[PDB]
Amino acid sequence: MGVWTPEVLKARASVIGKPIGESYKRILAKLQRIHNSNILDERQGLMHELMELIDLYEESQPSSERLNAFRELRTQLEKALGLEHHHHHH
């Protein structure tokens, strides 16, 4: 949980839908897989690459220090790596 950032956020920031076709969209798409595969033993491996991948994509186009805005996303991935069980439910 706490790992949500689908096109919804981009739609709000971008107001009108307008997804770019390319790899840069791959990172955004990974959200769909992560969503369902949230904190999933399988996603655990991807989680690591996700954080590293972003670090390479953050400077790729948005090197204007704008990565700070995306840094919020990395936090979710970083926290996810905590594998902490905050669910606690009967």
Side-chain angles (χ1 to χ4, degrees), residues 23 26-27 30 33-34 42-57 74 77-78 81:
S23 165
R26 184 183 188 196
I27 44 169
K30 288 275 180 183
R33 183 176 290 166
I34 291 167
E42 290 179 0
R43 189 261 281 206
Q44 286 182 5
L46 212 178
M47 193 201 292
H48 291 89
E49 181 176 344
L50 210 305
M51 183 279 273
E52 295 291 351
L53 178 58
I54 291 273
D55 290 345
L56 298 173
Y57 274 53
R74 285 187 289 165
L77 279 287
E78 190 72 7
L81 180 138

Side-chain angles (χ1 to χ4, degrees), residues 22-89:
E22 243 177 297
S23 165
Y24 179 79
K25 184 173 181 294
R26 184 183 188 196
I27 44 169
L28 186 65
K30 288 275 180 183
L31 280 291
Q32 186 67 21
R33 183 176 290 166
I34 291 167
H35 183 231
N36 177 38
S37 312
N38 56 11
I39 53 169
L40 188 66
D41 293 346
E42 290 179 0
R43 189 261 281 206
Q44 286 182 5
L46 212 178
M47 193 201 292
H48 291 89
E49 181 176 344
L50 210 305
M51 183 279 273
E52 295 291 351
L53 178 58
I54 291 273
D55 290 345
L56 298 173
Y57 274 53
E58 84 191 353
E59 189 172 13
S60 165
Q61 235 68 179
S63 70
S64 286
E65 205 73 8
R66 304 283 188 271
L67 55 103
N68 178 355
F70 286 88
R71 185 181 187 180
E72 292 293 338
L73 178 57
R74 285 187 289 165
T75 298
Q76 294 177 4
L77 279 287
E78 190 72 7
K79 288 181 176 290
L81 180 138
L83 300 176
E84 296 294 308
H85 290 92
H86 287 104
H87 304 287
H88 183 257
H89 188 67

